[PDB]
Write a protein that binds this ligand. Structure first.
Ligand SMILES: CCCCNc1ccc(C(=O)OCCN(C)C)cc1
Ligand SMILES: CCCCNc1ccc(C(=O)OCCN(C)C)cc1
Lengths: 154, 154
C-alpha cells in the first residue's frame, strides 16, 4: 500500500466511527462472523505521545467481545505498528476528519471505510472503491444503517 | 433487476464456464463455504425446447457436491424460472457468448460474472461492477486462477 494521507493530524481522528465497509486480499480474512479481520471499530483515542488506541468489537466464541488495541507511531505520521508474532502495519490512506477515514492493516491485507454516523456515505464508498482499485482484494462487505447501530453489526 | 440481454441466443451459452465473481444483497447468502448461494457453475446445457439445465458444485455437509438444476424458459428469452417453495427467477444481464456472461438469481438477490477460461478478465469484472452499481449488494467475492481450477474453488 502506497496511499497515505499527506499531512495527517492524528489528534483530529479522535472519537466515534462506524465500519461502513471492509475488504481483504483473502476471503477467509472476512468470510465468517468469527473470521480474524472481521473487526468493528468503536472509537479512536490518540495518546499525547501520538500513539493510537483502538476500541473495537470482535465476534469470539459465539458472542460479541469488547476489545482494545494500541497502535504505536512511526517516523511516518500516517503509519502505525501493532506488535504480535508478525510485524503488522496500520496505514491511514485518507480522511476529512469530520465524515470518513480509510485505512488498511497489512503484514496479507484488510482495509475499511470508517464514517462518523450510521449513514451510507456514497461519496466515502466511491473514494474507498477508488483506493481498492489498485489492491488485490477478493472479498468486500458493506453494512446498512440498522446493522451499524448493533453490536458486531448483527 | 432491469438489465436483460436484448436478443439473447440461449443455444450460444452452451458449454464450460467459471464463476469468476459473485455478489448478493445479504452477507449470509455468500459468507460461508456452505452459504446457500455459494454455487460454482460448471456447464450450461440449453434443451432443444429452450430450457437451460445448469451443472454446478455446492459445498454441502463438509464436502463439494455435484449438482444439476434445470431453469424453465418464459415468454422473455433472457428470463428463466426455477420451481421451489418460492418463485425464483434467473435473468441473463449480458453476454458476448465467447468470453463472459453476467446473470442474477432473484426471489433476495445474488449475481455472478461467468467466464469461459480460468483467467481474471478485468474487462468482464468492469461490466459486472457497472451492472451491480444499481443493485443493493452487501457482499462481493472474486477468485484467482488457481482456485478456479479446483472443486468448490478451494
Ligand atoms: C485508523 C486506524 C484503525 C485501526 N484499527 C484496527 C487495527 C487493528 C485491529 C485488530 O484487531 O488487530 C488485529 C491483530 N493484529 C495482530 C493483526 C483492529 C482495529
Ligand atoms: C446463466 C444461468 C445461470 C444459472 N445458474 C444457477 C442458478 C441457480 C442455481 C441454484 O443453486 O439454485 C438455487 C436454488 N433455488 C431454489 C434458489 C445455481 C446456478
Amino acid at each position: 500500500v502506497t496511499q497515505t494521507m499527506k499531512g495527517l493530524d492524528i489528534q483530529k481522528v479522535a472519537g466515534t466511527w462506524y465500519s461502513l465497509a471492509m475488504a481483504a486480499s483473502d476471503i477467509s480474512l472476512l468470510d465468517a462472523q468469527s473470521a480474524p479481520l472481521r473487526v468493528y471499530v468503536e472509537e479512536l483515542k490518540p495518546t499525547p505521545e501520538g500513539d493510537l488506541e483502538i476500541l473495537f468489537q470482535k465476534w469470539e466464541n459465539g458472542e460479541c467481545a469488547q476489545k482494545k488495541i494500541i497502535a504505536e507511531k512511526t517516523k511516518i505520521p500516517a503509519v502505525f505498528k501493532i506488535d504480535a508474532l508478525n510485524e503488522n502495519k496500520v496505514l491511514v490512506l485518507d480522511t476529512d476528519y469530520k465524515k470518513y477515514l480509510l485505512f488498511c492493516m497489512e503484514n496479507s491485507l484488510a482495509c475499511q471505510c470508517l464514517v462518523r454516523t450510521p449513514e451510507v456515505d456514497d461519496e466515502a464508498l466511491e473514494k474507498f472503491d477508488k483506493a481498492l482499485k489498485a489492491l488485490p482484494m477478493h472479498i468486500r462487505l458493506s453494512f446498512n444503517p440498522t446493522q451499524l447501530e448493533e453490536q458486531c453489526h448483527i
